[model samples]
Target: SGFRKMAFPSGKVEGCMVQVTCGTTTLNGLWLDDVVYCPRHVICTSEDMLNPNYEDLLIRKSNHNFLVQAGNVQLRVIGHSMQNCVLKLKVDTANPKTPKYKFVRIQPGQTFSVLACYNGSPSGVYQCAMRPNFTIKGSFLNGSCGSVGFNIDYDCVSFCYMHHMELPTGVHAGTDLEGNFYGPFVDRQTAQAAGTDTTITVNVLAWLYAAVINGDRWFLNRFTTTLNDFNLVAMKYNYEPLTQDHVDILGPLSAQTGIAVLDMCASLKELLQNGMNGRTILGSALLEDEFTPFDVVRQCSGVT
Candidate 1:
């Protein structure tokens, strides 16, 4: 190697003498700028380092199980830096008094794990068919233990709870607060003339109109500030909060006709009942088949 020069105020120095080497040359005074230092070895630790922000990390699962055709299931687990950690999961299928069926270990990751619960029966809840019953722990691959967090159950089971409610029965808006088109006709002869198709269609249309009018009345009542007896009736069966679509149509209907009877469902029902009673109300014809006020309550209350 040639001699390389490094500069100093008093004199020049050789790079090799001062441990400064570059391109197989010994550094001297003038060539100090050309000198470079390179260490042959770098130290790497065998132990893994934990991140400082580990506390802020969390884990979550998409779903504990899958929607089996008859009974298949999936599990989604979410967490951070969960590498080399053991996750134990299980399903609980013990009686209310006594518990059974427990923990099964799973591979670590922030994703879903599929586990088939019951193979024989197509339906019904079963015990968690895991080997170890309850409890799980996590440890690093090197036998070092990190914080053992909480374990979540990914119970892949099938079950159902059933119950029912009964409704009252009277003349109110037929089934859904809409008057039946065929009934309450002048007499049997008139009903017979309404033909199944015509009557069903008319009933449907009348209910549709009632729905529309109810929505309109809701918007009117909100802004109008004051509603009379008739206006108050419209809000009864057809209130604004029922649905957004209902309110949309009700807004325009109320605007076109200031007739509270037209906009108010309660008023419409009352007017129809009066007509049936021979009271001779102006909008009575509009409610020919419309239900009476009491009928609306019975239907909503789930009365047959």
Candidate 2:
């Protein structure tokens, strides 16, 4: 369901009309050239006159931002046949001489309300801030053409973090592989030296195995390949041990690594059986240290 065009007939009363203004800013006086309206309800495709070109209806600034011109923007909505609908008005402001921002949400069958919001200022690339009330939800089969409008002003209260950053170009040193260890050390040199160390080897291996099972890649660049990496991977495999066959293979290895191996194996196995993948252990610094509990000593010594 789609409808684009701000000019609507004065008699269309099934839906409400709203005026969007920058927060506390004059509405009728602003000469806006670009205005956008977003829907917040789900209706039968046949009933929505503004569904087909919803994106084109409003000016897109980014994933969470957009803009619309000032005027009587009309949205055709399917009434009570489904649930309800919501709509938001957005404004475009790419022109430095005329910076602008707008966002709104409307739900059908409900009184239309508008929210005034603006993006971070300084043009082109400002601090990547999310639009207030970022997500839009709509009800289906309710008769109410939801409409909303508002205005917003940017305030440079604190220093914008998006303003500066060292964006390095080129190869961007880091392993790109998914579900594997990158290295044993933070860098290539350190990894090479500790390649044979059991402690280092298991550490790296555990991280790699966890990455694979958990689908986590946040620290890929920081990971290094080495024996420690393999041990670490083995430790993780020991934990989840995908299948009984895997458990058989890693159970002894876990014994070799000691309590860390047993802990990881038990925790991962439990999480897997429960249909959970991976989760960061908050405030688990001591728990994460491979050497802390000394799993290697117990496992290698043939102790349970």
Provide the lDDT at 250 for model 2. Answer: 45
lDDT of 2 by residue, 20-50 (tens): 2322221111112222222222111333332
TM-score of model number 2: 0.16
Q: How high a TM-score does candidate 1 get?
A: 0.17
lDDT of 1 by residue, 92-166 (tens): 221122112122232111111111111212111111110111111111121111111111222221111000001
In model 2, which range of ten residues has the least summed lDDT?
158-167
- Output the lDDT of residue 199, model 2: 21
Which stretches in model 2 have alpha-carbon errors above 4 Å?
1-37, 40-46, 49-280, 283-304
Clashes of 1: 32
Q: Which candidate is the best by TM-score?
A: 1
CA shift of 45, model 2, Å: 6.1
